[model samples]
Target: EKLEAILIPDQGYHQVGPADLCTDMFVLSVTVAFATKLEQLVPSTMKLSAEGSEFFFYYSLLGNDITSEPFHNLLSPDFEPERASVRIRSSKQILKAFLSQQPSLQIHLCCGNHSLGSTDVSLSALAGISTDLDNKAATVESAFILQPPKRVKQTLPALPTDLQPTLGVAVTLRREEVALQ
Candidate 1:
């Protein structure tokens, strides 16, 4: 037992014995890149054309979050939108909150006050869903599909399996021994 004893820390016991060397703390970081493949969104004949469709998104977590710079023009599938991030201190099943959320990372999309569509996923979902603490930090990246918002699903054109809109995401779980700025 040469390298033994790593827990007991009743400093009041003597305030002399060797102390804390255990540091286990982590932070979860979620980043949203952009959404793609929106060519099939707006109906060109319904007083609105597919030439330019207002694109904006809102992702709720911790409370509620939204994205900006809803640029126009469906000339390209690449949506140059906002890059949003969310961070949280981890200990319990916190990082797991991305997995077992209080609800979920529901992505709400809209176009010129019109509900485009949305999807429900977790921060620790899709791409690189890593589970190794030895690296001290983990990162995952993936794109999730954005489906119909239900209430007005009939107003939009049919979504094919290969033509669904997808949002890009990059999530990182960083570990730190100490906190505070």
Candidate 2:
């Protein structure tokens, strides 16, 4: 049968042997184990917001969810620097909430004013309050350093050569009208 011809080594073609298959399986297993261990080493943290207006921002934990809210209202319309903090039940809860939302994790904080300057803060950068194993409550403290808004310049495109003659003709007509006046 055709199956026997392929299985037989005398047929002058490379046939998969048991030893070769076993080697591939062993290599695959080692690769999977190494990848899993490497993932464990990298701590998982959610990126609440990459860019938010600088203000006295604070976070609260309601069950498993973390909420970032403004701590103080700006008395004046002008920009002011304020301390930023995040309150969480445990680092584990944050890690768990982040894991549950995995690739599409996003939390936003409205910390800046459009007329005034804005600040940027990251959830992971916040400091932990205590290492108590029982409660595992953590608090991060930092300041929202405000920076001036960047100015953007707009440029006009060059006029096409085809329009040059039309411009000249309009100018000549204006000159003739001025002379008549």
Candidate 3:
């Protein structure tokens, strides 16, 4: 089994019903994909066993203290229903909110209790919203490949950049309209 995993959101978006917080907000369904060559990212001394390793994420809009969910077993590289997909709904759909706030879906890769890599995916991509005239739902899904930082010695442990040691993530946005309170 390959030591690869995708880190995605743990929560879901607000259900569209007769009433919600406000009609002006946007709903984003972001999923963290996986880590390719994750074993290469770990230093020589660190032991990253399949069962001991895990991938998790944090929504930028939410406070850093909250961790959505943790996907264990680090053995599934093929993300076709491997159980690492996390969906989160965001209410910050206003243009002004994104102009000032550069939020991101942050994925933290870890070896047991210790962290190996942290990738921050900017949500600024939502600045230019799209429209699907036929479906009434403007959807956006993008994938990103993350490379290990050359040196996290000052902060976290140093990682290997060779072999790509890459992380995978996908951000999805869907603009919906409903009643306002």
Candidate 4:
């Protein structure tokens, strides 16, 4: 018999957006690659993937304290549109490295963000939601687990990338109220 009730916080449902996962996967991949080069330690035995409304990242440093500052720093728009492609490639590299060490590693990416109710995990979120870390304590610790809601989907129309669009016509008509002296 399949158990329907899982004693997980927040009903065990979390959302992870595509864009955020893209960004995160990139950072994690690059960091792991660099680490492997710097040290002879085997890369993490985990992978990242996207499932329905959820994103997972494998091989978490269990019981390890990972600060938010460094991770956020890597999300900067240094490469912008190009970063998306770079992220995909980087993620593949990370997976390859991980698989070399551990034959079985899996992860997923979803459509949402992670939050602790009142605390802000990202510094950039100061403009939107500002919460202290102390007020938001982590209740669950798991690798590649579900997160929270993320940004809305972006719908950009196909417009000229080089030229900006203009509206309204410039006219030089004389006003009836203004009489010539």
Q: Give me the runs in candidate 3 sitting further than 4 Å from their true place.
A: 1-25, 55-61, 64-100, 131-143, 147-163, 177-181
Residue range 62-125, candidate 2, lDDT tens digits: 1223332343323222223322222211233333333233232122223443223333333232
Instruction: Write the residue-wise lDDT of candidate 3 on 1-181 in tens digits.
Output: 2111112235243322222443333444445555565555555534445455565544444332334356654444443322222222333333224322555656666544555566666655543443332234333344444445565433245456434445555544444452111
> By TM-score, who's the top model here?
1
Clashing pairs in 2: 53-111, 53-112, 54-119
Clashing pairs for predicted structure model 3, backbone only = 5-34, 5-35, 6-33, 6-34, 7-32, 8-32, 9-86, 13-89, 26-93
Candidate order by decreasing lDDT: 1, 3, 2, 4
TM-score (all chains, Cα) for each model? 0.59, 0.24, 0.53, 0.16
Per-model lDDT: 0.51, 0.23, 0.44, 0.19
**Segments of candidate 4 deviating more than 4 angstroms:** 1-65, 68-98, 101-152, 159-181
Report the Cα lDDT for candidate 4.
0.19
Ranking by TM-score: 1, 3, 2, 4
Tally clashing residue pairs in candidate 3: 9
